[PDB]
């Protein structure tokens, strides 16, 4: 299949435990390509726009609250059948019934606290990568 | 004794060859955290412009045309004595003369190619990090 | 009848004879609201992966040659029918097929020259303002 | 003495009424040159670091409340004595006790929504511009 985007953000929780690196091999040794990188703190506003979806959800608040707690690290990844293989590493978004070797199960503490956050689909990655990139952002590799 | 903070340049032989995750780790590892990040292509005069110190030097034009040959990153790394620590774990400019465990050791094929950059002072560092980042945008740590 | 968004560029020409306040203005007389605004140079790179579509055009080198030949200033505008609001004011492409008021009468010189671009239509809009600024960007205001 | 660079930032009250090209047009007049701007929406932490110099000073809140209230132009001028020039053309911070033609007499309502601020010394803007941008975004003229 072709090769596809999808957007990592690295949560305060993994940045404040300085795990970020470690996080970021695990997707390189998987053979997906980081072509886009930055560092922010989202403020309370950025994180409503971003998780737009679950605003009428029920823990909305802790989940933006949680999200904007410290710095964040957003990223673009790219390579083969891209969106299900980030999933794939990632592990289940609950910890405990994660797969031995995935982030979740390596780096997560708890269901909120749970290191790291991907794009759950194709359309889901196109709007999510938008959100936080331009597309002259993204550096796709040529050499 | 104090908390300092130096630059960190991946250059794009390291990237393109997807080894971002695994430098990073090693700066986290050594007790340095990332403080800032983000992935950028470098136009010519941006090359240009933070190599000024050494355009009167004559290779200048090979290391402006190599680091302008596609994408890196740049961060900033804050810790005790971050500058000398940086420069530890990094290793002598020339590869070759570079010992075990080291940056260069590990990712660098030659003088030209050497992987990664770094601040070499306490007075570069804050120029650099000026040159590449807004203060605003440097978050640090409170969690 | 909605409320609508377009991008601004001012191009080199004009910003280089110091008109681009004079250029805001005119957009903000008109009842249309700038609710992004940046000054880049556009690389040699980004050249035009913005005139994607004129790639295989003849002239395709000068027009790109001319916006990254100085800084231009890259705007969002907001407003009710922003897209041929902004076409009106701007006026024709070429400066001297273009209405008494128009910026293109005011500040072009030449057809090439021709002091700034606009979006053509909604669904280009859309596009150019994508490629240049993320969602979070993008401030409408309230107050 | 040469060239010098000061920061404007176009406060919320100006922005939200669309003054933005008029005031900037004022600044082109008067012989300064625009070599950096961006519109941001500034966070609770943004505005309390950017007057950290105020922060013992009673009013500090109120201050704070206001440049959050609403997006923001930030700007960097550059041009001959360029910091003296911004403050003739502002006039004095109190708008009652402005002079005609300037912009605190011409757009601001109140001491606290004075429209418009400015750097007031050589040092205080290297550490104001450093602060917003990076070395590498403020472009200076060629062409």
């Given at each position: 299949?072709?090769?596809?985007?999808?957007?990592?953000?690295?949560?305060?929780?993994?940045?404040?435990?300085?795990?970020?690196?470690?996080?970021?091999?695990?997707?390189?040794?998987?053979?997906?390509?980081?072509?886009?990188?930055?560092?922010?703190?989202?403020?309370?506003?950025?994180?409503?726009?971003?998780?737009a979806e679950?605003?009428?959800?029920?823990?909305?608040?802790?989940?933006?609250?949680?999200?904007?707690?410290?710095?964040?690290?957003?990223?673009?990844?790219?390579?083969?059948?891209?969106?299900?293989?980030?999933?794939?590493?990632?592990?289940?978004t609950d910890?405990?019934?994660?797969?031995?070797?995935?982030?979740?199960?390596?780096?997560?503490?708890?269901?909120?606290?749970?290191?790291?956050?991907?794009?759950?689909?194709?359309?889901?990655?196109?709007?999510?990568?938008?959100?936080?990139?331009?597309?002259?952002?993204?550096?796709?590799?040529?050499?």
């Amino acid at each position: 299949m072709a090769l596809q985007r999808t957007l990592s953000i690295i949560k305060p929780d993994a940045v404040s435990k300085n795990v970020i690196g470690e996080i970021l091999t695990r997707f390189e040794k998987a053979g997906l390509r980081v072509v886009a990188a930055k560092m922010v703190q989202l403020s309370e506003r950025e994180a409503g726009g971003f998780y737009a979806e679950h605003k009428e959800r029920p823990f909305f608040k802790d989940l933006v609250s949680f999200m904007t707690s410290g710095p964040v690290v957003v990223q673009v990844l790219e390579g083969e059948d891209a969106i299900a293989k980030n999933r794939e590493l990632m592990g289940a978004t609950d910890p405990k019934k994660a797969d031995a070797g995935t982030i979740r199960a390596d780096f997560a503490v708890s269901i909120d606290e749970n290191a790291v956050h991907g794009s759950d689909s194709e359309a889901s990655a196109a709007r999510e990568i938008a959100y936080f990139f331009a597309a002259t952002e993204v550096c796709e590799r040529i050499r």
